[PDB]
Design goal:
Chain lengths: 292, 49
């Protein structure tokens, strides 16, 4: 068992989140610094996010050790994932929800049915707090429990593009992101992000409380913003490049507006409808924890 | 101190693989963790229980 520090698991160097950039392992914050936003005439106002459902989907009798982190990260940032709600192994997180369950969530991002040797795993209390919320990804497809997949993106914009005044206001102009760019920059970004061990982030996010939580929320704001960025590019209506005197600025229109697009494109990862419903759910839960 | 003498210790995987299930079926509390702030009397209580 991995001990959880007074800070999160994210304080451990083992769980550093870092996109590749200019040939180096850049922190998400030093990528987001490259970003710049042109305003447009449209306005985003953030509606209250509906409380996530009480229901925890059944962890069906599964003999296998589900690879959950891979399923989640590929469902959110995966270049090729589709029909993510067909298998429905996300429900498996609710095996971890129970008090004194035999099941362990390994650092590998796998949900072992029982504790097993030479596989380090997160502290079960932490995982229980984490599962009590994120098992609800397992009902992202069921019609009764689906998240709104349009309004939620406003929050995304505010949490990404939004200046501190726009965030305090709860309302920002719809923006148009841009940054100096290398070829395939968003594909490479998203793949650097799929490799992130985000269960560390989500687990500290659900387990930590008090100042120790708030100290986490500032420290990892940029990380959450990078995840939000990859999703944003996934749902952006269009993603052009601009020549700018022997330099190129990648430009996505628009931050905070889900275009509901599903036809694939070379520039960025694409959501099938299932990935849209899933991502909407994920945002519902995660933003719910993020604002409390 | 002689080679048999000293402070005995073992890896957790050895613990899990062998002694732990025997602790389970013998109906005893799971032996206490030692924070290092722990009293020797507490260790005595655990070895007792």
């Amino acid at each position: 068992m991995l001990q959880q520090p007074t800070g999160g698991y994210t304080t451990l160097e083992q769980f550093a989140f870092t996109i590749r950039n200019d040939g180096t392992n850049a922190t998400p914050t030093q990528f987001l610094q490259l970003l710049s936003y042109e305003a447009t005439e449209n306005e985003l106002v953030k509606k209250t996010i509906p409380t996530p459902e009480t229901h925890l989907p059944s962890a069906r009798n599964v003999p296998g050790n589900v690879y959950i982190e891979d399923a989640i990260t590929q469902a959110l940032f995966g270049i090729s994932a589709q029909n993510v709600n067909a298998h429905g192994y996300f429900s498996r997180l609710s095996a971890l929800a129970l008090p004194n369950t035999s099941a362990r969530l390994g650092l590998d991002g796998v949900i072992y049915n029982s504790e097993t040797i030479n596989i380090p795993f997160y502290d079960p209390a932490a995982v229980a707090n984490f599962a009590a919320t994120y098992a609800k990804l397992g009902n992202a497809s069921t019609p009764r429990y689906r998240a709104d997949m349009i309004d939620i993106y406003a929050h995304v914009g505010l949490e990404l593009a939004g200046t501190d005044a726009e965030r305090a206001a709860g309302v920002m102009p719809v923006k148009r992101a841009k940054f100096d760019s290398w070829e395939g920059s968003l594909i490479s970004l998203s793949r650097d992000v799929v490799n992130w061990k985000i269960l560390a982030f989500l687990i500290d996010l659900c387990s930590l409380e008090g100042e120790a939580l708030r100290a986490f929320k500032t420290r990892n704001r940029d990380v959450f913003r990078m995840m939000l960025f990859i999703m944003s590019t996934a749902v952006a209506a269009n993603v052009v490049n601009r020549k700018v005197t022997k330099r190129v600025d990648r430009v996505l229109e628009y931050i905070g507006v889900n275009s509901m697009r599903t036809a694939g494109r070379t520039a960025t990862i694409t959501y099938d409808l299932s990935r849209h419903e899933f991502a909407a759910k994920f945002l519902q839960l995660t933003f719910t924890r993020w604002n409390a | 101190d002689d080679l048999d003498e000293g402070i005995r210790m073992t890896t957790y995987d050895q613990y899990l693989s062998h002694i732990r299930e025997r602790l389970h079926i013998t109906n005893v509390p799971d032996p206490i963790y030692i924070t290092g702030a722990s009293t020797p009397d507490q260790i005595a209580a655990s070895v007792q229980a």
